[PDB]
Amino acid sequence: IEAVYTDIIQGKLDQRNQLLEVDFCIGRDIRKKDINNIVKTLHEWCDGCEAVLLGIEQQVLRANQY
Amino acid sequence: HSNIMDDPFIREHIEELLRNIRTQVLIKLIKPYTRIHIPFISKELNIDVADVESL
Amino acid sequence: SIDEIYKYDKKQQQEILAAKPWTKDHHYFKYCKISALALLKMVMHARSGGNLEVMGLMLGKVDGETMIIMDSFALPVEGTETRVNAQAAAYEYMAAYIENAKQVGRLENAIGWYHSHPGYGCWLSGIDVSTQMLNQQFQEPFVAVVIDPTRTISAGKVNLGAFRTYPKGYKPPDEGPSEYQTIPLNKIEDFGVHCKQYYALEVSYFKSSLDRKLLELLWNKYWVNTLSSSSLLTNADYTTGQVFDLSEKLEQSEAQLGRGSFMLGLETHDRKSEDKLAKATRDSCKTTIEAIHGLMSQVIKDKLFNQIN
Amino acid sequence: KQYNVDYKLETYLKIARLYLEDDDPVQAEAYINRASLLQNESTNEQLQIHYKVCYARVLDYRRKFIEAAQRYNELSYKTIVHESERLEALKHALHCTILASAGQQRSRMLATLFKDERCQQLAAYGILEKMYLDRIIRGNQLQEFAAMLMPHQKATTADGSSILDRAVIEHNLLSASKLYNNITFEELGALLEIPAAKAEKIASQMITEGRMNGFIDQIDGIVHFETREALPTWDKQIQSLCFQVNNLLEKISQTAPEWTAQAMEAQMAQ
Ligand SMILES: [Zn+2]
């Protein structure tokens, strides 16, 4: 509760299930080695977006054929 | 009681009045939530458990 | 050719107006094609300031059994029609607009009139029936379009009802759409009295250029955010009402079909009962495809955002 | 004698003010009633301001801390009232809002009071900042507020476990509803530093009044404060994610205009 009230993390607590549901949280520092992971994560997101874009185009072509 | 149930008619109707007020208090108590034990209601109403079950 | 409908052939229109095929059949005109421009302008006029009872003229042409509306415009109404009819300085304005259009290009003449019904449904009242009957006397054809600005919010979409009257004394041979509409207590009386004195045209929108333009603009500025949950259809009042209305329509169809089996040789019943079955099926199909499109946008986005990588 | 409305208004106002320090509500309530009855007849603006101040004082005194806060806030944005008197009225509004029953109306009043800079001037500025910005309340802020209120508690004392502590528990349960999806009796009581029976009773009272949403199960001892199914939680998270994307993109463009030039060069090259 101290961390949440200082506007660090936003979320909800489930005591019956003993779970901490965090809707939003701040990030950490990135200077030396996490950049490669970020680039890999960004590349995966870019590839995934392109795959969905190609998939939408294929469905549009299929709809035109129908 | 010397001026509340002293009248035989009010003496007859006091049971119904108590039943009605207990019903109202019970309904008000059980409105906000669900799945409540009976002995707690009996202690809150200051009556027997069987009366709570009947009500 | 998407833009073929925009070509105006004056001689062809004169030929059709000289032929007058509508005199040979009172059900001659069956379809009403409305431009995206005219739809938008009429809905925008109808909405005006919340729920205002307004009216205007429609410019367009005829093509076989189809009436085509290309444009629309309004008339001056000093003191909210303080005189008879919503016209006041109408003739002058109309003529000026016509000549101005003929110069700048618009060569389409009067094809009908439109007016709004704020929150009472798309139908023709006794006044509107008499108006469209007089509009069938002068200006031979003419069509009465009715809009609902308040039902564009309530129902969510709402169609622009297009109607044509029957001549005095003439009976619809069997025409019975059995279409249910919610009409206020102070309006349902008049509605039921003059409902059979006219018929509804099939309203359709040619996929032109004006329509897709608006679709792009909205989904590129305001509806660019395709989140908003994914289903406002979840609120089960519009679908459930359509589902319940569909149930009632087919239940009445079965009741008529069951009674129609004892009568051998009633051709009118057959056509009308099958017409009801067809209309009810389309309403279910349109509702079905709307929900399917709702989940399709849901699935693609939800799958992407959650577990893309 | 047919006394003019101003004289009757002044007399009833004086009686009402006298009764506030003699501590006798019944008759002063009736006198405020009659002063309001003849109030919409008078003319003097300063007399009307004095009447409104006295009426807000009466509302603060009886139990109407929320209505007193509303009246004091309405009177705070005035001109003829002395700046010192305006600040005092705003301080009374703030203290009433803090002491008010913690609900939607109190939340709206707290949000409204988080705008005045003379609110920031006051010593309770931090207090309502904590209230509105959402936090849990300990027992150390009690002393200063209690001292400020009326060298004890506002209105005429409290003795209802202190109205200060009633409001503290109410706002603590509100903050719990903000975070805790559900909570057990013992842990909730430990959080509120009260016995579990007191915690469950106060939670049930808040739910009955509509100031805290949820339901209580007595078998397992678990009070399910809030459960937003699965769609509203997911939609807000995506919306927050997209908003943070937009905030980032604006920050790079503003703080690093060279990136915007680089972005234009990159998009033109490809
Ligand atoms: Zn009408």
From Swiss-Prot, chain A:
Presence of keyword Acetylation: yes
Localisation: Cytoplasm; Nucleus
Keyword terms: Acetylation, Coiled coil, Cytoplasm, Host-virus interaction, Nucleus, Phosphoprotein, Signalosome
Cytoplasm among keywords: yes
A cellular component annotation (GO) from this entry: nucleoplasm
Biological process annotations from GO: COP9 signalosome assembly; protein deneddylation; regulation of protein neddylation
Superkingdom as given in the UniProt entry: Eukaryota
UniProt function note: Component of the COP9 signalosome complex (CSN), a complex involved in various cellular and developmental processes. The CSN complex is an essential regulator of the ubiquitin (Ubl) conjugation pathway by mediating the deneddylation of the cullin subunits of SCF-type E3 ligase complexes, leading to decrease the Ubl ligase activity of SCF-type complexes such as SCF, CSA or DDB2. The complex is also involved in phosphorylation of p53/TP53, JUN, I-kappa-B-alpha/NFKBIA, ITPK1 and IRF8/ICSBP, possibly via its association with CK2 and PKD kinases.
Family: Belongs to the CSN7/EIF3M family. CSN7 subfamily.
Assembly and interaction partners: Component of the CSN complex, composed of COPS1/GPS1, COPS2, COPS3, COPS4, COPS5, COPS6, COPS7 (COPS7A or COPS7B), COPS8 and COPS9 isoform 1. In the complex, it probably interacts directly with COPS1, COPS2, COPS4, COPS5, COPS6 and COPS8. Interacts with EIF3S6.
The name this protein goes by in its record: COP9 signalosome complex subunit 7b
Name of the encoding gene: COPS7B
Curated annotation (Swiss-Prot), chain B:
Locations listed in the record: Cytoplasm; Nucleus
Protein modification: Phosphorylated by CK2 and PKD kinases.
Subunit structure: Component of the CSN complex, composed of COPS1/GPS1, COPS2, COPS3, COPS4, COPS5, COPS6, COPS7 (COPS7A or COPS7B), COPS8 and COPS9 isoform 1. In the complex, it probably interacts directly with COPS1, COPS4, COPS5, COPS6 and COPS7 (COPS7A or COPS7B). Specifically interacts with the ligand binding domain of the thyroid receptor (TR). Does not require the presence of thyroid hormone for its interaction. Interacts with CUL1 and CUL2. Interacts with IRF8/ICSBP1 and with nuclear receptors NR2F1 and NR0B1. Interacts with NIF3L1.
Family to which the UniProt record says this protein belongs: Belongs to the CSN2 family.
Primary role: Essential component of the COP9 signalosome complex (CSN), a complex involved in various cellular and developmental processes. The CSN complex is an essential regulator of the ubiquitin (Ubl) conjugation pathway by mediating the deneddylation of the cullin subunits of SCF-type E3 ligase complexes, leading to decrease the Ubl ligase activity of SCF-type complexes such as SCF, CSA or DDB2. The complex is also involved in phosphorylation of p53/TP53, c-jun/JUN, IkappaBalpha/NFKBIA, ITPK1 and IRF8/ICSBP, possibly via its association with CK2 and PKD kinases.
Protein name listed in UniProt: COP9 signalosome complex subunit 2
Gene behind the chain: COPS2
Swiss-Prot record, chain C:
Record flagged with keyword Metal-binding: yes
Cofactor: a divalent metal cation
Domain MPN, residue spans: 32-169
Residues spanned by motif JAMM motif: 115-128
MF (Gene Ontology): deNEDDylase activity; enzyme binding; macrophage migration inhibitory factor binding; metal ion binding; metal-dependent deubiquitinase activity; metallopeptidase activity; transcription coactivator activity; translation initiation factor activity
Cell location: Cytoplasm, Cytosol; Nucleus; Cytoplasm, Perinuclear region; Cytoplasmic vesicle, Secretory vesicle, Synaptic vesicle
Biological process, per Gene Ontology: exosomal secretion; negative regulation of apoptotic process; positive regulation of DNA-binding transcription factor activity; positive regulation of transcription by RNA polymerase II; post-translational protein modification; protein deneddylation; protein neddylation; proteolysis
Domain notes: The JAMM motif is essential for the protease activity of the CSN complex resulting in deneddylation of cullins. It constitutes the catalytic center of the complex.
Note: The CSN complex is associated with some 'Lys-63'-specific deubiquitination. Such activity is however not mediated by the core CSN complex but by the BRCC3/BRCC36 component of the BRISC complex.
Record's protein name: COP9 signalosome complex subunit 5
Organism expressing this protein natively: Homo sapiens (Human)
Organism lineage: Eukaryota, Metazoa, Chordata, Craniata, Vertebrata
UniProtKB/Swiss-Prot annotation, chain D:
Segments forming domain PCI: 61-230
GO molecular function annotation: deNEDDylase activity
Main location: cytoplasm
Assigned keywords, A-Z: Acetylation, Cytoplasm, Cytoplasmic vesicle, Nucleus, Signalosome, Synapse
Residues in coiled coil: none
Presence of the UniProt keyword Cytoplasm in the record: yes
GO biological process, any: protein deneddylation
Subcellular locations according to the entry: Cytoplasm; Nucleus; Cytoplasmic vesicle, Secretory vesicle, Synaptic vesicle
Gene Ontology terms: cellular component: cell junction; COP9 signalosome; cytoplasm; cytosol; nuclear speck; nucleoplasm; nucleus; synaptic vesicle
Highest rank taxon of the organism: Eukaryota
Role summary: Component of the COP9 signalosome complex (CSN), a complex involved in various cellular and developmental processes. The CSN complex is an essential regulator of the ubiquitin (Ubl) conjugation pathway by mediating the deneddylation of the cullin subunits of SCF-type E3 ligase complexes, leading to decrease the Ubl ligase activity of SCF-type complexes such as SCF, CSA or DDB2. Also involved in the deneddylation of non-cullin subunits such as STON2.
Family label: Belongs to the CSN4 family.
Listed name of the protein: COP9 signalosome complex subunit 4
Species: Homo sapiens
Lineage: Eukaryota, Metazoa, Chordata, Craniata, Vertebrata
Residues of the full protein shown: 137 to 406 of 406
